[PDB]
């Protein structure tokens, strides 16, 4: 099917997805150069996981 | 030194060496809680099936107190034969009665060794025990090996012979058909020889075909060194 996620696993996948953003520009102003790179960036292909 | 051997694996009860118990069929019980004396008990052959692991045919019997149990099938049984259990069972084939109640010089199978333990003796295809002599003290019965064991006279047994004779009369034919049989039973196979097994694998025999030390082994020999002709009294076929 689907497969075939468990509800929770989708919660976890969703979280990893959240971590896989790019910071916003304004924080960056607030910082005035700065913590960047966002360090977690996870690529779907590039990386695994956990499950 | 070398690994545990082929026999030592067996003893673990690990699964390559574990009998299936889920494709296999019932065991014999005669049941002594309704006793032999003050009998009450006849039954009807409900069906006859082949039991895989006995390599013999077996009977389901429907008793008239309402219990269903298997009894190892006699030759020349019909489905709808009545089998009786007790001493006041008729003296005929497939009927079960105590040894004392059974005549001398009649063929008998499924003999008890402790009264009321359900048959622990003569439960193979086509082979049969002979009642040679009977005395109220002890009844001596002659076993399939030619060898006489004394049993209590209040053991149960069934009159007749087992069914499924000729069993080794027909050959096994090929390695395929044989493979098929061993799955039906349990018997570690294909089984090779120790002689071209390496010195690690097996106590006798090296790289090439020749035995190490003598094949013939002690009766006080170690576990894992008791392979070959075990405690042989003689060997060969000559003076």
């Amino acid at each position: 099917m689907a497969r075939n996620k468990p509800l929770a696993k989708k919660l976890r996948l969703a979280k990893a997805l959240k971590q896989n953003r790019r910071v916003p520009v304004w924080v960056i102003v607030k910082t005035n150069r700065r913590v960047l790179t966002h360090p977690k960036r996870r690529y779907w292909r590039r990386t695994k996981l956990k499950e | 030194m070398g690994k545990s051997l082929i026999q030592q694996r067996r003893g673990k009860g690990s699964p390559t060496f574990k009998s299936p118990s889920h494709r296999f069929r019932g065991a014999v019980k005669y049941i002594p809680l309704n006793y032999t004396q003050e009998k009450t008990l006849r039954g009807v052959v409900e069906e006859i099936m082949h039991d895989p692991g006995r390599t013999a045919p077996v009977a389901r019997v429907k008793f008239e107190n309402g219990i269903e149990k298997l009894i190892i099938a006699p030759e020349g049984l019909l489905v709808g034969q009545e089998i009786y259990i007790g001493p006041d069972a008729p003296i005929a084939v497939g009927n079960t009665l105590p040894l004392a109640k059974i005549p001398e010089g009649t063929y008998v199978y499924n003999i008890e060794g402790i009264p009321g333990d359900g048959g622990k003796y003569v439960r193979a295809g086509g082979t049969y025990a002979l009642v040679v002599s009977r005395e109220p003290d002890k009844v001596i019965v002659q076993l399939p090996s030619g060898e006489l064991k004394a049993f209590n006279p209040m053991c149960r047994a069934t009159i007749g012979v087992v069914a499924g004779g000729g069993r080794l009369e027909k050959p096994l034919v090929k390695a395929g058909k044989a493979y098929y049989k061993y799955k039906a039973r349990n018997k570690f196979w294909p089984t090779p020889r120790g002689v071209k097994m390496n010195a690690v694998n097996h106590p006798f025999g090296g790289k090439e075909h020749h035995p190490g030390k003598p094949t013939t082994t002690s009766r006080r020999a170690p576990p894992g060194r008791k392979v070959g002709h075990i405690a042989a009294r003689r060997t060969g076929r000559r003076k």
């Binding site: - | 030759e75 012979v161 499924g164």
Partner: protein
């Protein structure tokens, strides 16, 4: 000459296939029902024989309905 031994081909050697041809041939023979007496009994399975006419199923030898050992039991008497 060949029996049912033709299945084997070239193979198994004389004695086994000769045995096989003989044992199967007799196995094939019409056998007299112990129940009725008409020549109905055929082999369902190993050691299991059944009479088409009466429907009786009974245990017997693997190849033949009756073995020489089975025959001995009848002779001692009830």
């Amino acid at each position: 000459k060949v029996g049912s031994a033709g299945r084997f081909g070239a193979r198994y050697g004389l004695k086994i296939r000769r045995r096989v041809a003989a044992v199967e041939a007799k196995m094939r023979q019409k056998h007299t029902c112990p129940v009725c007496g008409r020549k109905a009994v055929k082999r369902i399975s190993t050691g299991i024989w059944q009479c088409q006419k009466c429907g009786a199923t009974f245990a017997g030898g693997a190849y033949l309905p009756v073995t020489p050992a089975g025959k001995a039991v009848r002779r001692i008497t009830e």
